[PDB]
Design an enzyme around this catalytic site. Structure first.
Site, PDB file in Angstrom:
ATOM      1  N   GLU A  59       0.827  -1.192   0.000  1.00  0.00           N
ATOM      2  CA  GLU A  59       0.000   0.000   0.000  1.00  0.00           C
ATOM      3  C   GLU A  59       0.872   1.256   0.000  1.00  0.00           C
ATOM      4  O   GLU A  59       0.407   2.345  -0.339  1.00  0.00           O
ATOM      5  CB  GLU A  59      -0.903   0.011   1.228  1.00  0.00           C
ATOM      6  CG  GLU A  59      -1.992   1.064   1.166  1.00  0.00           C
ATOM      7  CD  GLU A  59      -2.396   1.561   2.538  1.00  0.00           C
ATOM      8  OE1 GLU A  59      -1.702   2.457   3.086  1.00  0.00           O
ATOM      9  OE2 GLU A  59      -3.407   1.046   3.069  1.00  0.00           O
ATOM     10  N   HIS A  60       2.134   1.105   0.383  1.00  0.00           N
ATOM     11  CA  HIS A  60       3.052   2.235   0.416  1.00  0.00           C
ATOM     12  C   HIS A  60       3.709   2.505  -0.934  1.00  0.00           C
ATOM     13  O   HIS A  60       4.041   3.649  -1.244  1.00  0.00           O
ATOM     14  CB  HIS A  60       4.156   2.015   1.455  1.00  0.00           C
ATOM     15  CG  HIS A  60       3.876   2.639   2.787  1.00  0.00           C
ATOM     16  ND1 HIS A  60       4.873   3.149   3.591  1.00  0.00           N
ATOM     17  CD2 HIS A  60       2.717   2.828   3.461  1.00  0.00           C
ATOM     18  CE1 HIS A  60       4.343   3.624   4.703  1.00  0.00           C
ATOM     19  NE2 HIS A  60       3.036   3.441   4.650  1.00  0.00           N
ATOM     20  N   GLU A 136       6.426   5.096  10.906  1.00  0.00           N
ATOM     21  CA  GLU A 136       5.004   5.297  11.148  1.00  0.00           C
ATOM     22  C   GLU A 136       4.534   4.409  12.279  1.00  0.00           C
ATOM     23  O   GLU A 136       3.468   4.639  12.848  1.00  0.00           O
ATOM     24  CB  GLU A 136       4.182   4.954   9.908  1.00  0.00           C
ATOM     25  CG  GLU A 136       4.573   5.707   8.666  1.00  0.00           C
ATOM     26  CD  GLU A 136       3.638   5.410   7.522  1.00  0.00           C
ATOM     27  OE1 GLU A 136       3.331   4.213   7.316  1.00  0.00           O
ATOM     28  OE2 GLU A 136       3.218   6.370   6.829  1.00  0.00           O
TER      29      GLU A 136
END
Lengths: 443, 101, 421, 220
Positions: A59-60, A136
């Site tokens: 997803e990154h 993150e």
């Protein structure tokens, strides 16, 4: 133009399938702008222990460019047309979607398809997104509400796939290889498991065309055309207590196993959740709020916030509540809280359900307040409920509910069940599973 | 008519709470409504009602009363709390009714 | 029945009525007013803020209790949004209960009682409400900005200052409502409703006199510098100069000079290449950050400039690099194309912001209150592209030349003073 | 000191020379009395230009000498009085720091009469920058200054603090006779000059109270 009608006017959602399996669907409006995206049924539940956090490591990179067009070209091509590309990934359902002018409807589809099929995965970018994710997690770790729900799953479904965080481990993110991300996309990002959904001012037909053109999957064997069924997740009545008396407030979450998308009871359960509702420090309502628990919460200063929740999954679920409070009032809150659950299984009135229904109805509509939200509904409906569930339908089911129904259902999933508990913070005042457990009966 | 309207003045002098300097409303027994009402009294009205009472008590410990001159008079008795209290009981009946409903 | 049309009566007293039946299963009525923290004086500060929270209090027709239980009974909702010059009381329920949720909306905005006790039992909430909001340093530098950027009216804080918590009275509330919630300054918008009704109500129940009553003292410009040393590792900063006002055809120039320098990413975890300012800052600092195009359009004035979020040490280089990148754009550094793309991002942003019932009703309202009109989404489209590559380079100059204001909070030890840029 | 004292020797860390800013900090806080201080770079310690301000201080007025007085020998005071009607106070602010200094006035006035008081406090400082200083005002201000100094050293605290300060900023000790000379060796000029240096240099300002009627530095 009574409610009743405005409900049946809404344009039906069309569904069409290709030979590869992909499913296309949309709701057409006179909106000049719109949203389109592909909702993939694949999350972390689908990951094993060695690739935990691929669906996330992916997803990154789904935005750092493809093979046809590198980074700057991809980004620039999107920004310059005023489109909004963004998405996410959960335990069992990922998604990438774009918000743009109804004009670029077709030019968008090509973009979506180019990310889910030809993601670049440049290895220069992988040793950069490594540090970024690892960073993150340091942020996300200081988000109590999250640290809490993860821990909830982590122990409620302990020993299984659902008990894993979406972001995955630290060791995984530190070692995941180009190979794995690749193999993850290959194994999971597949046509039969994807759903191109869109809503706004767009032609269902033109959409399906653009699809046939860029979503050109080729299926030979039966394997490719099959949608795997996942090994069941076992619910365990347990608890996990993460204490740190140095944090300002404590977080507590309590839940019982849920039925899962399929079951019609989910409706009743949501009605139930409406009766208790939620509250928080800035509600103006105050001591007059209709939610018994919110009142007590206000009278006695039981918390900073609390919320019911009915998270559903394919085969399972989590039905509970979460409150935040000061070290010295956790006990009373927890006490009043279970209290209100028991009040559900035994003495719910018709007055409470009436309001409950009206509150659900409005939330059900606010669900579809924008093209993104309507697109999200369509994406997740096909992927989970099978087809699309209309508001006119939802509303019929929500009206069918009454007292006797709520009681019989809450009693079904709540009464005398062994719940899962997750406490984080200065949780000394809250205590003993044995006690909390006994709060599950009589009321 | 003007019947119990003169009876009232009689009863008022009969009670004798004015001999202590207390308004008819200073004697109300403090149940739940009365308590709420009193919290709604404006600063000064509350501080005056307080002194009247703290003075009546001091009288009662001494076993005396006010010299006839200072006695409250049936027509000069300010029902300072009566209206607030009326509202408190009003707001309450609403709630009560609204909850059975 | 397809798409009907946006009617908009304009009654005697000056009370506007803008409706629009779009057949959604839900309505959303709303009273927009020309009230706000700028009509406050040093004497009644924060009386605007409190009035915002006092929305659930007893009114001449409905009780504190019944208003909440009444609205809750129909899955309804009440809310009050406000800016330094614009309050918006508004409900939102299912079509069949517009009558129910209305009574309270009308009672709340026109017949408030502000009972001494209720009022003083509510003032401690200002302590709270203000503490939660102030968790975002973002809203901390904006308060101080407007304070440095002005000498009055708009310089008034949006959240009641501390010393005034618990010192507001029922009068200050009353007097602020009597002298600002006047029919001439009020517009009763609405969506999911037939004009004949929304109108029917506005005339039968709305009393309050008209005429601006008290008028805001035109906002003088100051050009201040408020720095807030507070440890916090991230230095937030905003440097701005007087921009345009609500309407000015010069403001559409800034709105385009906005999207040209960069106005917040469009791609999750993106790099925003179409953002001059962003890219410019990147080529200067090594560590994380964010920088954008700040643009505020107020009735009799406006603000414009950038905003930077950077590490305490790289705050210098990030803020300075954020400047040169604004000057270089004031000196022909704008392509005829950068202007064409920025024109779309602006049409898009606008076009999307009106998909959500809230953003839409706020579009109809705002306009139907600042001119009793309604531009078509077609006319606004023209004003956007009728902007030349010049207008842009001009706005960019007006910035480099005009006097500047500044706000900053964090470990400012490495942040620069306005007289060094 | 010798046989017992120790620790490290030599400057160690040195203070980063004080740059001048010329800011404006206003603190709105309700408080009925608006306090304000407008100043500009003054002189450093031991520098020549100091004595001049110290004399320009006592010339404009440096806090009453007669209980419940009216301070006539105070230009600034008298000047403010002839402007406002209600109570107040205003004085000559003077700070002498190692590598810099401050100078200007300070006003305490009602929230409403803050405007007139502060402005009147200015003109009264300009008028003194433009020859408004008698050769006599300068002779009286010279005594008040010899007095203030001579008295401040009667209390053991004030005395030890006199010996100390000096014996630390130069390891010397001027006689109370030498300091007397420096005081009067100030001409009627030096004074009018300090007064100018103020009206010309960049100004800083601080104010707290119901500032609603107080002026911004860019209005004086």
């Amino acid at each position: 133009a009574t409610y009743a009608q405005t409900l049946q006017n809404i344009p039906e959602t069309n569904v069409t399938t290709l030979d590869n399996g992909l499913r296309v669907a949309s709701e057409e409006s006179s909106q000049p702008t719109c949203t389109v995206g592909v909702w993939i049924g694949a999350g972390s539940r689908y990951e094993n222990e060695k690739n935990n956090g691929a669906g996330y490591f992916v997803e990154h990179l789904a935005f750092k460019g493809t093979k046809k067009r590198p980074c700057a070209a991809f980004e620039k091509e999107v920004e310059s047309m005023g489109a909004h590309f963004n998405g996410y990934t959960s335990r069992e359902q990922t998604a990438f979607y774009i918000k743009a002018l109804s004009k670029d409807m077709p030019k968008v589809v090509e973009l979506l398809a180019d990310v889910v099929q030809n993601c670049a995965l440049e290895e220069s970018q992988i040793e950069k997104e490594r540090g970024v994710i690892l960073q993150e997690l340091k942020e996300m770790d200081n988000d109590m509400t999250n640290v809490t729900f993860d821990y909830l799953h982590a122990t409620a479904f302990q020993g299984t796939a659902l008990a894993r965080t979406v972001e995955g481990t630290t060791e995984n993110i530190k070692h995941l290889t180009r190979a794995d991300l690749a193999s993850y996309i290959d194994t999971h990002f597949k046509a039969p498991r994807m759903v191109l959904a869109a809503a706004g001012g767009i032609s269902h037909k033109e959409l399906v065309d653009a699809a046939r053109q860029h979503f050109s999957g080729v299926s030979f064997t039966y394997k490719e055309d099959a949608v795997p069924i996942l090994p069941r997740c076992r619910f365990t009545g347990s608890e996990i207590r993460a204490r740190d008396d140095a944090l300002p407030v404590a977080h507590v979450a309590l839940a019982v196993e849920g039925p899962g998308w399929a079951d019609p009871d989910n409706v009743v359960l949501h009605v139930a959740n409406a009766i208790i509702g939620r509250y928080d420090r800035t509600f103006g309502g105050g001591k007059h709020l209709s939610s018994r628990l919110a009142a007590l919460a206000v009278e006695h200063k039981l918390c900073h916030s609390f919320q019911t929740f009915n998270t559903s999954y394919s085969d399972t679920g989590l039905f509970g509540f979460h409150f935040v409070a000061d070290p010295l009032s956790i006990d009373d809150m927890m006490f009043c809280a279970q209290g209100e659950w028991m009040r559900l299984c035994t003495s719910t009135t018709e007055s409470e359900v009436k309001r409950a229904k009206n509150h659900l109805r409005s939330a059900m509509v606010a669900q579809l307040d924008g093209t993104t939200p309507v697109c999200e509904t369509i994406g997740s409906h096909l992927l989970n409920y099978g087809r699309r569930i209309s508001l006119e339908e939802w509303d019929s089911r929500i009206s069918a509910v009454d007292a006797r129904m709520v009681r019989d259902v809450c009693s079904k999933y709540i009464y005398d069940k062994c719940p899962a508990l997750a406490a984080v913070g200065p949780i000394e005042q809250l205590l003993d599973y044995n006690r909390i457990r006994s709060g599950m009966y009589w009321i | 008519g003007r019947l119990m309207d003169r009876i009232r003045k009689w009863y008022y002098n009969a009670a004798g709470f004015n001999k202590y300097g207390l308004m008819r409303d200073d004697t109300l027994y403090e149940d739940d409504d009365v308590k709420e009402a009193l919290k709604r009294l404006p600063k000064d009205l509350y501080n005056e009602r307080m002194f009247r009472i703290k003075r009546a008590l001091d009288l009662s410990l001494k076993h005396r009363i006010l010299p006839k001159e200072q006695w409250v008079k049936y027509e000069e008795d300010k029902p300072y709390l009566e209206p607030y209290l009326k509202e408190v009981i009003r707001e309450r009946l609403e709630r009560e009714a609204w909850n059975k409903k | 029945p397809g798409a009907e049309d946006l009617e908009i009566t304009k009654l005697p007293n000056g009370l506007i009525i803008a409706s629009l039946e779009n057949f959604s299963p839900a309505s959303r009525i709303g009273v927009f007013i020309k009230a706000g923290s700028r009509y406050e004086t040093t004497a009644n500060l924060g009386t605007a803020h409190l009035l915002r929270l006092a929305s659930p209090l007893t009114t001449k027709g409905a009780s504190s209790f019944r208003i909440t239980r009444g609205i809750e009974a129909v899955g309804g909702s009440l809310s009050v949004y406000s800016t330094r010059e614009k309050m918006t009381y508004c409900v939102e329920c299912l079509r069949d209960h517009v009558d129910t949720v209305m009574e309270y909306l009308l009672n709340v905005t026109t017949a408030p009682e502000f009972r001494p006790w209720e009022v003083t039992d509510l003032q401690p909430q200002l302590k709270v409400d203000k503490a939660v909001a102030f968790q975002s340093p973002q809203v901390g530098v904006l308060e101080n900005l407007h304070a440095a950027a002005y000498k009055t009216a708009l310089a008034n804080p949006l959240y009641c200052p501390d010393y005034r918590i618990g010192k507001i009275t029922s009068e200050q509330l009353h007097h602020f409502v009597q002298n600002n919630f006047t029919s001439a300054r009020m517009a009763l918008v609405g969506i999911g409703v037939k004009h004949s009704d929304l109108k029917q109500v506005a005339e039968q129940f709305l009393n309050i006199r008209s005429g601006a009553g008290t008028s805001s003292a035109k906002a003088t410009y100051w050009g201040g510098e408020i720095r807030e040393q507070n440890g916090h590792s991230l230095v937030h900063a905003a440097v701005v100069t007087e921009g345009a006002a609500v309407g000015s055809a010069e403001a559409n120039a800034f709105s385009v000079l906005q999207h040209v320098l960069g106005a917040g990413p469009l791609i999750k975890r993106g790099s925003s290449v179409t953002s001059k300012l962003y890219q410019g800052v990147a080529k200067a600092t090594t560590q994380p950050f964010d920088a954008s195009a700040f643009n505020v359009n107020y009735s009799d004035s406006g603000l414009f400039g950038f905003y930077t979020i950077s590490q305490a040490a790289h705050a210098g280089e990030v803020i300075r690099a954020a400047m040169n990148q604004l000057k270089a754009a004031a000196q022909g550094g704008v392509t005829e194309e950068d202007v064409t793309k920025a024109k779309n991002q602006l049409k898009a942003t606008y076009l999307m912001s009106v998909e959500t019932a809230q953003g839409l009703l706020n579009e109809i309202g705002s306009e139907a209150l600042l001119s009793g009109t309604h531009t078509a989404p077609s006319v606004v489209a023209q004003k956007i592209d009728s902007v030349t590559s010049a207008d842009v380079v001009n706005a960019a100059k007006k910035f480099v030349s005009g006097k500047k204001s500044m706000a900053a909070s964090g470990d400012l030890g490495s942040t620069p003073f306005l007289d060094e840029l």
